[PDB]
Amino acid sequence: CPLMVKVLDAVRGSPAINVAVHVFRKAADDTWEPFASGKTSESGELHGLTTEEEFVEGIYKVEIDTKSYWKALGISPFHEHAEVVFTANDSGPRRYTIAALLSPYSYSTTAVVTN
Amino acid sequence: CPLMVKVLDAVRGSPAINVAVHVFRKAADDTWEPFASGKTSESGELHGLTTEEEFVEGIYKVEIDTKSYWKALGISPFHEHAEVVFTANDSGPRRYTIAALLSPYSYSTTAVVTN
Amino acid sequence: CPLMVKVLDAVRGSPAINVAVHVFRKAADDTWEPFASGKTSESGELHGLTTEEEFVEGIYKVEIDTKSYWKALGISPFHEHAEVVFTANDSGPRRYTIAALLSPYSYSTTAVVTN
Amino acid sequence: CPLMVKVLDAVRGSPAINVAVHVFRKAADDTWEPFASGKTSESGELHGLTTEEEFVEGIYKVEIDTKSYWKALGISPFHEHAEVVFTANDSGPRRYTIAALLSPYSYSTTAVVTN
Numbered sequence: 001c002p003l004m005v006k007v008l009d010a011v012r013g014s015p016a017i018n019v020a021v022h023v024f025r026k027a028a029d030d031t032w033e034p035f036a037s038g039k040t041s042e043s044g045e046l047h048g049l050t051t052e053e054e055f056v057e058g059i060y061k062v063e064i065d066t067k068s069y070w071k072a073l074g075i076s077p078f079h080e081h082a083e084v085v086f087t088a089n090d091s092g093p094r095r096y097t098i099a100a101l102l103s104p105y106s107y108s109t110t111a112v113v114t115n
Numbered sequence: 116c117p118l119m120v121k122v123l124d125a126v127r128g129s130p131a132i133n134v135a136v137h138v139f140r141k142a143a144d145d146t147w148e149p150f151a152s153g154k155t156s157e158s159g160e161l162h163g164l165t166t167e168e169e170f171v172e173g174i175y176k177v178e179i180d181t182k183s184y185w186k187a188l189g190i191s192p193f194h195e196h197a198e199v200v201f202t203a204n205d206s207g208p209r210r211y212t213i214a215a216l217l218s219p220y221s222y223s224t225t226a227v228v229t230n
Numbered sequence: 231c232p233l234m235v236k237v238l239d240a241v242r243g244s245p246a247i248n249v250a251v252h253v254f255r256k257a258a259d260d261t262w263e264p265f266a267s268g269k270t271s272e273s274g275e276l277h278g279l280t281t282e283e284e285f286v287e288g289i290y291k292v293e294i295d296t297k298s299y300w301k302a303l304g305i306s307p308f309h310e311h312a313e314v315v316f317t318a319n320d321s322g323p324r325r326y327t328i329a330a331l332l333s334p335y336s337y338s339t340t341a342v343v344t345n
Numbered sequence: 346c347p348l349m350v351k352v353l354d355a356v357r358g359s360p361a362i363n364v365a366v367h368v369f370r371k372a373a374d375d376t377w378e379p380f381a382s383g384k385t386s387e388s389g390e391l392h393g394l395t396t397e398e399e400f401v402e403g404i405y406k407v408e409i410d411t412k413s414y415w416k417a418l419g420i421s422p423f424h425e426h427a428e429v430v431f432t433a434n435d436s437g438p439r440r441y442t443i444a445a446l447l448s449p450y451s452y453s454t455t456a457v458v459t460n
């Protein structure tokens with residue numbers, strides 16, 4: 001898969017397990033079209049979101065459902081979701097890892113891009 | 116000043132100056148509607164975005180135009196922007212500071228809610 | 231005020247109040263020697279740590295007692311402290327703000343150097 | 346190995362390759378005793394630092410050589426090194442991943458602890 005998402009929990013020191021991740025791709029009419037979705041595993045990783053054939057160039061938005069995650073842990077979350085927006089494959093196909101580190105009132109995200 | 120935005124640059128260790136910031140409030144039809152906007156000052160701060168009367172409870176999105184900031188510096192960015200989506204709840208006297216720390220391929224955001 | 235320390239809490243979305251901060255300067259015998267210290271205020275800030283005359287170029291270490299902070303809140307922490315080690319270089323008029331964002335199993339630190 | 350270190354570069358969007366990592370363990374006389382060391386691989390990971398037999402309870406300090414990393418990339422670093430200090434195995438053996446995300450004037454670190 002050319003697009004992996006990894007999510008970590010900064011409160012418990014663990015991977016963020018069973019976190020819903022939605023990926024959208026910007027359409028011609030400037031609206032967000034559903035592209036792919038899934039849940040993080042026991043390792044906090046989400047593999048198999050897409051394939052090389054489906055992952056075309058475009059502007060993508062990765063929405064991480066942090067609200068449900070904190071609510072299920074009984075913690076009061078600030079953010080509705082963690083939203084990462086970027087242009088992908090504009091200079092040819094690349095592999096992307098989008099990582100996110102979550103806290104109730106803060107999040108950090110980084111990207112690892114390889115050719 | 117119930118809502119302030121502060122933006123910092125992790126590459127040069129400075130405030131991020133003249134960065135466009137747009138604030139949206141979630142409408143009844145599940146759409147993002149413009150609420151406030153401005154450009155960060157020499158201190159990387161954006162004050163006077165809204166008034167106590169205008170800033171009601173609801174779901175807000177703060178979009179920071181980080182792509183334009185890195186491009187002006189001649190540094191290649193990954194993200195289109197940094198978007199912070201959160202619920203604003205009236206739970207006593209509160210002031211919100213949304214702070215973002217930027218790098219070309221990463222960003223962190225936090226909220227500081229004070230009385 | 232050539233050196234300021236600001237500490238934020240990512241769990242409760244607030245300044246981190248009454249946190250002990252110790253500043254050390256690297257000696258000629260490669261040892262860490264005490265330089266300044268204090269406790270963060272109600273705003274999570276610690277001002278008046280040093281004077282322009284005292285704050286010379288060199289290698290500094292800022293140690294934030296995060297373990298005592300989380301323990302007082304009844305939250306289990308991972309780190310003993312958060313230590314920020316950096317070189318202070320005179321390159322025109324400069325003020326250093328060392329900011330730290332804390333979670334029980336994570337921390338982020340940045341420096342804001344302003345003229 | 347019960348202790349893994351992963352390091353990422355927030356400027357280039359890549360793993361931080363060939364970064365020196367030194368691990369110390371606090372001795373009875375309050376001094377830092379060398380414990381283990383190594384360099385991150387092409388994936389930014391450092392495996393095989395230690396073994397279950399050698400990794401006893403104690404206070405450990407993981408020092409990441411960020412200064413050499415930025416200097417070799419021709420970037421001006423602020424920090425001398427990224428220092429992560431924590432008590433390990435105090436309630437029995439655990440597996441620890443210490444991750445760090447690097448920028449020239451900032452770093453973030455988190456821990457993933459598993460039983």
Ligand SMILES: O=C(O)c1ccc2nc(-c3cc(Cl)cc(Cl)c3)oc2c1
Pocket residue numbers: 106121123212214215216223224225236238329330331338339340
């Ligand atoms: O309210 C202020 O003046 C003020 C100052 C310094 C600040 N630093 C931050 C900050 C630091 C890190 Cl390490 C990560 C993140 Cl996400 C944010 O938020 C701030 C606010």
Ligand SMILES: O=C(O)c1ccc2nc(-c3cc(Cl)cc(Cl)c3)oc2c1
Pocket residue numbers: 006008099100101108109110336351353442444445446453454455
């Ligand atoms: O254990 C792994 O393989 C692995 C992978 C990707 C990872 N990304 C991070 C990371 C991300 C952010 Cl946004 C902030 C911080 Cl402090 C750390 O930790 C990781 C670990």
